[PDB]
Design a protein around this ligand. Sequence first.
Ligand SMILES: N[C@@H](CCC(=O)N[C@@H](CS)C(=O)NCC(=O)O)C(=O)O
Ligand SMILES: N[C@@H](CCC(=O)N[C@@H](CS)C(=O)NCC(=O)O)C(=O)O
Lengths: 236, 236
Amino acid sequence: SARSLGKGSAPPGPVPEGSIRIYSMRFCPFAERTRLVLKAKGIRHEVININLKNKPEWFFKKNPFGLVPVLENSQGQLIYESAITCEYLDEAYPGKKLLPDDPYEKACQKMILELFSKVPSLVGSFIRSQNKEDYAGLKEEFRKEFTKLEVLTNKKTTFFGGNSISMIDYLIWPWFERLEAMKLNECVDHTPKLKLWMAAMKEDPTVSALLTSEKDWQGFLELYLQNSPEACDYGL
Amino acid sequence: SARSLGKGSAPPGPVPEGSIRIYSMRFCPFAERTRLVLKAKGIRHEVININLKNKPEWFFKKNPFGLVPVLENSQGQLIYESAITCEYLDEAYPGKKLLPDDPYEKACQKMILELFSKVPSLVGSFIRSQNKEDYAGLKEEFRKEFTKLEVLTNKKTTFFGGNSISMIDYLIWPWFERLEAMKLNECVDHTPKLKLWMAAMKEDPTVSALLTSEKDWQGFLELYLQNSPEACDYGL
Ligand SMILES: N[C@@H](CCC(=O)N[C@@H](CS)C(=O)NCC(=O)O)C(=O)O
Ligand SMILES: N[C@@H](CCC(=O)N[C@@H](CS)C(=O)NCC(=O)O)C(=O)O
C-alpha cells in the first residue's frame, strides 16, 4: 500500500525512533535524488507518497512550498529541497560518505551541479510540449547543455567526482534516467564521456535498484498528460 | 589601484602562497557575500576587480560563466558561484565557523537561503525598471517575499541562525544593504523581526566594515544606468 495520500487523508503520525521519513512521489526525479541517497547509505526509512494534483491540506505544514521531496525525522524536524535533503542525509548518517572530505572537491561537485542546472526544466518542458517546433529547439538545447557537462567538467574518471560513484552522480542521474525513458539517448551521441558515464551508472547497484521500468514510466506519463490524479499511483 | 581590469589587460600572475584571490566587482552584492566571509574569517587575500561591461578575455578561463565572484587559490584552483565560494572559505580556513556543526542547522540555513531566493532578482528588476507600473507591483512583490522571511523562518533570535551572526546572515545581507540604499526600508515596515535584524546587522563589525557609502552607491548607479564602462570604478 504505497498508494499516494491526497485531500482528506489523516495527517500522518510521528516518525518512529530509528527511522526517517520521506514525503515523495514515485515518478518525481527530485525525490529520486533523496531515495538514491537513502538506498546508497542503507538508511532505514518510511515512504509516504503525496498526491500532487490532490494534495493533503496538512502537507503544506510539512513544506510551505508544497513540493516533494521532504524529509521528516523522528525528532520532528522537516527538511525540503532535494539537494538540501541529500546533503543532510549524508552528514547525519553513518557509512560511505557520498560527499568528499576535501573542501575543493566538495566545491567542484557543487560547480558541476550548477553546470547541470538547466536540464531539469528542459526535460519538463519536453514532456509538456506538443508542437513540432518546440521539439526541434528543445533538442538543440539538450545538445548545448550536454556539451557543457562534457566539455566544462572535463571528466577523466568514470564518475563526476572521481573513480567511484558519489553525491554528484546521484544528484544528476534522475534526469538522465528520464532522458533514456523518453527515448532521447541520441542527445548524448556527441558527448562520448557522458555516454559512457550513463552505462557505468546503470551498473551501480543503487542506481540499478531504483530504476523505474519502461512500463511504469509510460503508465504514469499517459495519465500525467491527461492531468489525471491517478497518475501518481500507476502500476498500483 | 583597485581599478577594474578590462579587455586587453594582462592575464594576472599566479596567486601567491599564503593568499587567496577574489575576482570581484565593488558594487556586486553576490561578490559582497564572499568579501563578507573573507573579512569575518580574517582571511589574507587579493582583490582583482573585473570590468563587467568590458571583460578581460582571459576571465572566461576563470569562470566559464563570466561572472563574479570567483576565487582562485595559490594551488591554482578556481571556485565560482557566491554560495559555493562562501561555503568553501568557511571549510578551508581556520577560526570562527560561520556554518553550524550540526546537520539540521546547516540544512535549516540553506532552507532560509531558499526562502530568500526571489529577492535578488526583484532588486535588479527594480533598479532596471522605469515605469510607474512596475514600481507598484515590484513593491507588492517585496512585501510578499519579506513576510516569507518573517513568517516562515519564525526567527526567535537576533540572527537567522541563532544568537550570533553566521553564514546565513552574511549570505542575505547584501540585498538588504541595497534595499536601504534604494530608500526602500519601508518594504520591511510590516516585518518587525526583519526590521530589527537589519539594525542588529549594521552593528556587526564585519557588516559595518564592508558597507558601501551612499555617495559611492549613487555614483555607481548613475553610470550603471548610462550603461557606462566606468561605473565599476566610481569613487576611484
Ligand atoms: N527545487 C525542488 C523542486 C521539487 C519539485 O519540483 N517536485 C515536484 C515533483 S517532481 C512537486 O512537488 N510538484 C508539485 C507541484 O508543483 O505542485 C527540489 O529540488 O526539491
Ligand atoms: N549566481 C551567481 C550570480 C553572480 C552574478 O550575477 N554577478 C554579476 C555581478 S553582481 C556578474 O558577474 N555579471 C556580469 C554579467 O552578467 O555579464 C552568484 O551567486 O555568484
